[PDB]
């Protein structure tokens, strides 16, 4: 599958990135996994162990093998104090097929939902599985969520309504589950609601971070849809937005402003949206050389946004610099709101996650087995 | 060389 030509170009650009890292990073840790992960999410927990020079952090990872046994993994990592690093397996759980995406429940972080190459979305409570997985590889989810006909990626837990989960699928639908309901015994729960507003593969879904009834969806039909779970319709959203000129792959709500939303597309742009008036696209971020697949706001800075995708790059944006005049020289590198380009990966970035406890720290995973934990130099954002 | 802050900031945008 490899392009020996492109590989030489990538490798030589990497060597240049590597020696530039002391300029650009306060922290760079790189780890090669046996298998690539399509998913990353930091767990909310952190601790500074007595008599140690590092902090303990946790990552939810997955595995991607077509041939062999897959696993849902929680990784323990050492993050060195500002006065290299280490990764270990906290727990490893047998998983049928690759883990498309894995998300922890905000109210109960040891509950993790996963998307699979099949239609069932699985739920795991990692406190209810053996410390070491049985080599037989039999996958025993605590819950199987029924409702989809095809696989997907989009996953979202309601952070205001415990146990409520959204999922997006290639079958054109968004499914809704309430995992606290169901029968006594007990493993299978059916979709409470199935939303069919889209006419193509729905790529991502996301609850509003403040209103428990609002969520957004995003599809290959180039539309952004805003839904209300109160309403007795599941075929028509509250708002239908012509968001992009190509497939929309991701969306992310700002954790500081209940009205603003970000959207990422195959048209190589990120769009800013305001929920109070969706006829007007607030802004367009341009710089990416290929399809954008993931977008996430910083959990510490309201004006900071990050995006990534097929161009092996991760871009960090600063909203507070939009419209700011640049010299003709600086304009060649991109618009004034482009803060930082991360060139540490040598293949497509599958997913990334902002560290919720250490400002500016990000974990990104690529298709060539690499996971990087990094933090850009203070000199770059401290202006 | 590219040690000043404006230069580092410009390196950052170039990746
Ligand atoms: As591991």
Author numbering:
A (entry chain B): 7 to 89, 111 to 410
B (entry chain E): 27 to 41
Source paper text:
RbAp46 and RbAp48 (pRB-associated proteins p46 and p48, also known as RBBP7 and RBBP4, respectively) are highly homologous histone chaperones that play key roles in establishing and maintaining chromatin structure. RbAp46 folds into a seven-bladed β propeller structure and binds histone H4 in a groove formed between an N-terminal α helix and an extended loop inserted into blade six. Surprisingly, histone H4 adopts a different conformation when interacting with RbAp46 than it does in either the nucleosome or in the complex with ASF1, another histone chaperone. Our structural and biochemical results suggest that when a histone H3/H4 dimer (or tetramer) binds to RbAp46 or RbAp48, helix 1 of histone H4 unfolds to interact with the histone chaperone.
